[PDB]
Design a protein around this ligand. Structure first.
Ligand SMILES: CCCCCCCCCCCCCCCC(=O)OC[C@H](COP(=O)([O-])O)OC(=O)CCCCCCCCCCCCCCC
Ligand code: NI
Ligand code: NI
Length: 291
C-alpha cells in the first residue's frame, strides 16, 4: 500500500547525517530508528546537529529514567474514569487533511475533585502513556486512512468560562510540566491549536501562558471567542466534529463524543495494516533492506 510521503533531498541528507552520528556514539535504539522521529528532533532545533544530538541524548536518558519504554507494561491508571469526569479530554476523528483532532473541555475541569482522585505525578505518567499510544498507534492509523504521512494533531481547547481570577499557580505549573515533557520528548507533534470560547476574562490567561510557551508553538495557536463553529467546520468535516462544537457527531451509542475515542485507530482493518503490513516509510524500508 503506497502512502504519499514526500521526502526533501536536503532533509534526506540531514537526517542520514544525524543518524550516522547517533549510530557512531551508540545513541540510536532500533525502536527509535525511524526517519520521521529523527526529522521531528532535527526540525525542533532548526537542523543544528550539535543541539539536536543534545536534545536526542536527553530524550534517551528521559525515556530510561521515566520508564517510558515499559509504560504500556508497567502503568495502570485505575482512576482513569474518575479523572475523565473532572477533566473531559479525548481524540475525536480527523481534520480534512487526515490529522487526528484532540479536544479538551477546560471550562468543565474541576481542579479540587481532580486532586482527590489522582496526583500530578500520576496524571503526567498517564499523559506520557497516551502520547506513546498517539505516536505508535493513532498517528500511523491516520497515515493509512489518508494514504499520506501524518505525524501531528489538530487540538481544540474549549475554555468556556475560564478567566484569569480563577487561573491558579498549580494549573499554570501543570501546563508548563506537560509542555516540557512534550517539547523535550514528543517534538513537532502539534500541527495547530484552536482555543475557543475565550471570554474577556481569558485575555490575561493567554497573556501569562504565552510567557512560558515555546514561541514556535505560540505561532500555531489561534484564540477564538464564542463564534468558533464556522472556523472549525472550515478545517474539520461536520461528521468528525461533535454537535456541541457545531458538527453532526453525537457518538450516542459510545457515551458521547468526549468518551468515544472515535478515529481510524478504532478500525480493525486499519490496525491490522499497522501490526503486520508493509513498512509505512520507503526510506526506513530502504535503510533496513540495505542493513
Ligand atoms: C481551570 C482550567 C485552566 C485553563 C487553562 C488554560 C489553558 C491555556 C492554553 C494552554 C496552552 C497550550 C500550549 C500548547 C499545547 C501543546 O502543544 O500541546 C497540545 C496537547 C495535545 O497535543 P497533541 O497530541 O494533540 O498534538 O494538549 C495539551 O495537553 C495541552 C493543553 C494544556 C493542559 C491544560 C491543563 C489545565 C490545568 C488543569 C487544572 C487542574 C489541576 C489543578 C491542581 C490543583
Ligand atoms: Ni462523536
Ligand atoms: Ni518517509
Amino acid at each position: 500500500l503506497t502512502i504519499e510521503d514526500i521526502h526533501d533531498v536536503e532533509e534526506l541528507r540531514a537526517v542520514d547525517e544525524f543518524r550516522n552520528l547517533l549510530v557512531s556514539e551508540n545513541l540510536l535504539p532500533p525502536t527509535l530508528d525511524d526517519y520521521h522521529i529523527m526529522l521531528r528532533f532535527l526540525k525542533a532545533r532548526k537542523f543544528d546537529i550539535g543541539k539536536t544530538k543534545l536534545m536526542w541524548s536527553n530524550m534517551i536518558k528521559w525515556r530510561k529514567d521515566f520508564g517510558t519504554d515499559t509504560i504500556f507494561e508497567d502503568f495502570e491508571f485505575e482512576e482513569f474514569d474518575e479523572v475523565l469526569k473532572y477533566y473531559p479530554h479525548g481524540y475525536h476523528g480527523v481534520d480534512k487533511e487526515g490529522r487526528p483532532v484532540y479536544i479538551e473541555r477546560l471550562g468543565l475541569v474541576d481542579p479540587a475533585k481532580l486532586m482527590q482522585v489522582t496526583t500530578v505525578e500520576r496524571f503526567i505518567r498517564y499523559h506520557v502513556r497516551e502520547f506513546e499510544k498517539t505516536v505508535n498507534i493513532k498517528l500511523p492509523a491516520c497515515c493509512i486512512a489518508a494514504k499520506r504521512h501524518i505525524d501531528s494533531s489538530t487540538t481544540i481547547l474549549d475554555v468556556q468560562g475560564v478567566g484569569f481570577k480563577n487561573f491558579s499557580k498549580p494549573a499554570r505549573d501543570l501546563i508548563i510540566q506537560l509542555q516540557k515533557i512534550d517539547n523535550d520528548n514528543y517534538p513537532e507533534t502539534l500541527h495547530r491549536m484552536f482555543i475557543i470560547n475565550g471570554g474577556s476574562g481569558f485575555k490575561l490567561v493567554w497573556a501569562t501562558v504565552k510567557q512560558f510557551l515555546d514561541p514556535k508553538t505560540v505561532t500555531k495557536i489561534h484564540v477564538i471567542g464564542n463564534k468558533y463553529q464556522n472556523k472549525l467546520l472550515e478545517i474539520i468535516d461536520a461528521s468528525q466534529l461533535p454537535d456541541f462544537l457545531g458538527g453532526t457527531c453525537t457518538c450516542a451509542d459510545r457515551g458521547g463524543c468526549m468518551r468515544s475515542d472515535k478515529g481510524p485507530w478504532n478500525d480493525p482493518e486499519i490496525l491490522k495494516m499497522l501490526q503486520s503490513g508493509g513498512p509505512l516509510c520507503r526510506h526506513n524500508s530502504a535503510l533496513n533492506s540495505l542493513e
